[PDB]
Amino acid sequence: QLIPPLINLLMSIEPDVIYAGHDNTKPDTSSSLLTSLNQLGERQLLSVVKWSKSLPGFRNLHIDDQITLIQYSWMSLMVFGLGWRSYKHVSGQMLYFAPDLILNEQRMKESSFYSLCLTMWQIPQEFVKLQVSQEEFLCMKVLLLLNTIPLEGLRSQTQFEEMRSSYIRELIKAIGLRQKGVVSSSQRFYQLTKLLDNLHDLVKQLHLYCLNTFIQSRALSVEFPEMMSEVIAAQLPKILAGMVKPLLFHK
Amino acid sequence: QLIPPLINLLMSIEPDVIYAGHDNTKPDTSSSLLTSLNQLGERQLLSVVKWSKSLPGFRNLHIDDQITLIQYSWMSLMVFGLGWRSYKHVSGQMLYFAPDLILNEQRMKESSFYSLCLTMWQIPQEFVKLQVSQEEFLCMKVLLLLNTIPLEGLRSQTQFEEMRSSYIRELIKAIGLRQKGVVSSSQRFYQLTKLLDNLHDLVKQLHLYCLNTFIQSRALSVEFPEMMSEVIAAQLPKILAGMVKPLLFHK
Ligand SMILES: Cn1c(C#N)ccc1-c1ccc2c(c1)C(C)(C)OC(=S)N2
Ligand SMILES: Cn1c(C#N)ccc1-c1ccc2c(c1)C(C)(C)OC(=S)N2
């Protein structure tokens, strides 16, 4: 009723529940956990591709641009969605990767990658502190898809600029749904966009761990499915080397 | 008598000629050329480790630090040695990888590989311009070995620093063999140490190209030998991610 139409459209095209297909009747091993995380990843990737086809504005960018944005942003979209699920289903106090892959802190501690779990866990904790709304989350998730471009820019740079600006304007409207008053709503825009800026650094730790694990995947018995392997091979070294342009809302 | 004894020692421990074992017989492909450079890189890795065992001071660092410095500097030493040979044998006008692997423009077909070679070519071009002497080159090449350290520094940090100052003093002596005046001498030291600073950015492009290729090796039909492979897997992602401290002579 009071919800802006683009936001209702964003809510309508959100994915259904995605399962990891993890055993759970067997004790965790570093290899089985990471394999399920990658299987979950492959499924989430498929879901991003489907979502992106319905995302207003996106289909009108050159196909190369679309592929590039998905390849740059997949880890940040996954970790943001994890943040949201963990916030909404478990009050932020477990990592809700999937309904069949939920790690409470004890399961994190016994994982082999406790510190990485803790890094990821920061996000749901920030959602709790900021009380991020569904409408703000939906807009912020679009901006993450649009949050890095090549050094040379995109083929459809003009159209990207219009689309990114439109979702920023939409995030502003989502904030205005609750944050009444110029000073509160102004501060809120700072905080939410600052959070997105801060994700670049958090995602860099995930990127490095993921790349090392991919390079060592045979030794470590971690499987990487096809689309996951393709995105990692295409872009992660270049992203880690800073040979792309992360977009920031603040200096 | 005129040549400082340490520089004489550096001349004497310099590696013998290294062949790539390249098949000039058959026409070259991009994959077969990259394979040959990786084979040359394997052979050069062994020569670097042998060289370092006779390099005054080096064997006195903690063994972990020795391994770290070689693994950090492998690419830079290889490209610096390439600049020296191209300068010496072909007036800087071809890339003299080995006596059986010399590339000119016509042999750099793929634009990606050609751009990479243009990057490497800057070094012999500068050697030709500055008329770098063997004595300068030999001191500079030790400082390259010593030109990046871990973020937490080395185990033998004190010894490393003394060793680095020693070779900086030896470079000054090298410059004094020819650059007679105090002003000329200081400006020459600036130029040579700026060239070393500038190698970090240059080598970063080689590191990224190398990691991408390693990641896609099976698909590109490019062979990476065992020792090279370990160096790339152990350090390149971390180096590219900026998780080391490059040392700079100038701000
Ligand atoms: C699946 N997922 C979500 C979700 N949901 C958030 C982050 C990730 C995700 C997916 C795959 C990987 C990783 C995280 C990490 C553990 C860094 O390392 C490797 S090797 N693969
Ligand atoms: C062998 N070598 C010299 C010499 N001499 C200088 C630089 C290199 C050297 C060695 C191996 C590789 C590379 C350069 C590049 C082309 C970057 O990419 C790949 S995939 N491997």
Curated annotation (Swiss-Prot), chains A, B:
Recorded GO MF terms: ATPase binding; DNA binding; DNA-binding transcription activator activity, RNA polymerase II-specific; DNA-binding transcription factor activity, RNA polymerase II-specific; enzyme binding; estrogen response element binding; identical protein binding; nuclear receptor activity
AF2 as annotated region, ranges: 6-251
GO cellular component: chromatin; cytosol; mitochondrial outer membrane; nucleoplasm; nucleus; plasma membrane
UniProt record, GO biological process: cell-cell signaling; glandular epithelial cell maturation; lung alveolus development; maintenance of protein location in nucleus; negative regulation of gene expression; nuclear receptor-mediated steroid hormone signaling pathway; ovulation from ovarian follicle; paracrine signaling
Domain NR LBD: 1-232
SUBUNIT field: Interacts with SMARD1 and UNC45A. Interacts with CUEDC2; the interaction promotes ubiquitination, decreases sumoylation, and represses transcriptional activity. Interacts with PIAS3; the interaction promotes sumoylation of PR in a hormone-dependent manner, inhibits DNA-binding, and alters nuclear export. Interacts with PRMT2. Isoform A interacts with NCOR2. Isoform B (but not isoform A) interacts with NCOA2 and NCOA1. Isoform B (but not isoform A) interacts with KLF9. Interacts with GTF2B.
Biological role: The steroid hormones and their receptors are involved in the regulation of eukaryotic gene expression and affect cellular proliferation and differentiation in target tissues. Depending on the isoform, progesterone receptor functions as a transcriptional activator or repressor.
Family note: Belongs to the nuclear hormone receptor family. NR3 subfamily.
Domains (record comment): Composed of three domains: a modulating N-terminal domain, a DNA-binding domain and a C-terminal ligand-binding domain.
The protein's name in its UniProt record: Progesterone receptor
